[PDB]
Design a protein around this ligand. Sequence first.
Ligand SMILES: [Ca+2]
Ligand SMILES: [Cl-]
Ligand SMILES: [Zn+2]
Ligand SMILES: [Zn+2]
Length: 223
Amino acid sequence: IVGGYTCGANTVPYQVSLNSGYHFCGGSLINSQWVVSAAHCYKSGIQVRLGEDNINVVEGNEQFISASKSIVHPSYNSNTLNNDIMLIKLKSAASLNSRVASISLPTSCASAGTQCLISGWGNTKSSGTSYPDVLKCLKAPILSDSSCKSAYPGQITSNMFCAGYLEGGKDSCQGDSGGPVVCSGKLQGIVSWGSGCAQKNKPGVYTKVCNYVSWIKQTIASN
Ligand SMILES: [Ca+2]
Ligand SMILES: [Cl-]
Ligand SMILES: [Zn+2]
Ligand SMILES: [Zn+2]
């Protein structure tokens, strides 16, 4: 995340780190047994780490559980990143406490202008590589579709929305993929792609979760 701040140890209690020997993506806990992340984060051999603050230091409040299965959205297109969402089931249930909590799924989509909180352990430099070890946060509004589509012509579908600042300066960045975008207490987005990080007129693009609630609910209930 670039132009963001240190959230604080466990202040985004629904934030997860996907690890396959190292941290490679973020995710959101939706209930004791399931995590939602980006389909482009699909890997075989995932370990989910909950209650994480510093990914390189075991400070006692962590839970490391292996994934029992992964379900990529049936219509995921790796070329356009359209329908970039995946569900991960935990082999054992997470013990929910003050530091490990689930986030709610939306009942309706959020309007442009709404302020959201984007978090993760990604790169913090636009022009440079600096990978932080503690969680970073960024408060950013949802942009109108018009400004999102002018920045990426022919690339935005109805399953994506942009958030950030057009001036640039603030944005999600690689590493952060699969992480949450929460607005008014609901998980409204998943970090999906962007043009580099924090550039001017290049906001981040997020998977629009409100369009997949029935698929999420139906799939978790059947698996
Ligand atoms: Ca840790
Ligand atoms: Cl992340
Ligand atoms: Zn990351
Ligand atoms: Zn990515």
